Design a protein around this ligand. Structure first.
Ligand SMILES: [Fe+3]
Length: 185
């Protein structure tokens, strides 16, 4: 497996693997995972908020993909959401996220069912698309933050949040807390 020595290396390798029309999911996953998280390389992107997790754009991938870092304050979690028909890779950079995989709801209303539950290990890279299922991810810690590196292809700025009690969903517009290390409006 090709091992990126820096975050910069990883970005460059990603620019190659997504330059084409096919993407080898397992290959990307392994190369993401092989990069050893180095806080010195990504602290410029680690901009936290007291109340919610933040999304911090790192690279726009020549429109082929978005690479972003997500910052999870203590106890922070996402809603149950989909991924708008894109590939979605998420790699741990610091701390640990619990991923809860959910099945899709019917038109009928009732409680959503868990298909899987795991903690992402150190440097681990996970993968999801809409055909895999829905998920919620959560900082496991109420005393330490978590930081993850996310890659989406194609890029997408809307998704759906799902009410665990009914399965009803809402369109959500996703925003960036910062881009290239610079706070956004
Ligand atoms: Fe997600």
């Amino acid at each position: 497996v090709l091992k990126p020595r820096t975050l910069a290396d990883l970005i460059r390798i990603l620019h190659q693997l997504f330059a084409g029309d096919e993407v080898n999911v397992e290959e990307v996953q392994a190369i993401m995972e092989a990069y050893e998280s180095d806080p010195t390389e990504w602290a410029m992107y680690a901009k936290f908020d007291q109340y919610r997790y933040t999304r911090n754009l790192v690279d726009q991938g020549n429109g082929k993909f978005n690479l972003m870092i997500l910052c999870w304050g203590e106890g922070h979690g996402s809603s149950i959401h989909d991924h708008t028909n894109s590939h979605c890779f998420l790699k741990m950079l610091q701390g640990n996220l619990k991923e809860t995989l959910f099945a899709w709801p019917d038109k009928k209303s009732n409680e959503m069912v868990k298909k899987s539950e795991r903690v992402l290990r150190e440097n681990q890279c996970a993968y999801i698309n809409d055909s895999v299922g829905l998920h919620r991810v959560e900082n496991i810690s109420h005393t330490e933050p978590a930081v993850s590196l996310h890659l989406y292809s194609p890029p997408f700025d809307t998704c759906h949040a799902f009410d665990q009690r009914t399965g009803h969903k809402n369109k959500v517009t996703m925003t960036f807390h910062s881009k290239f290390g610079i706070r956004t409006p």
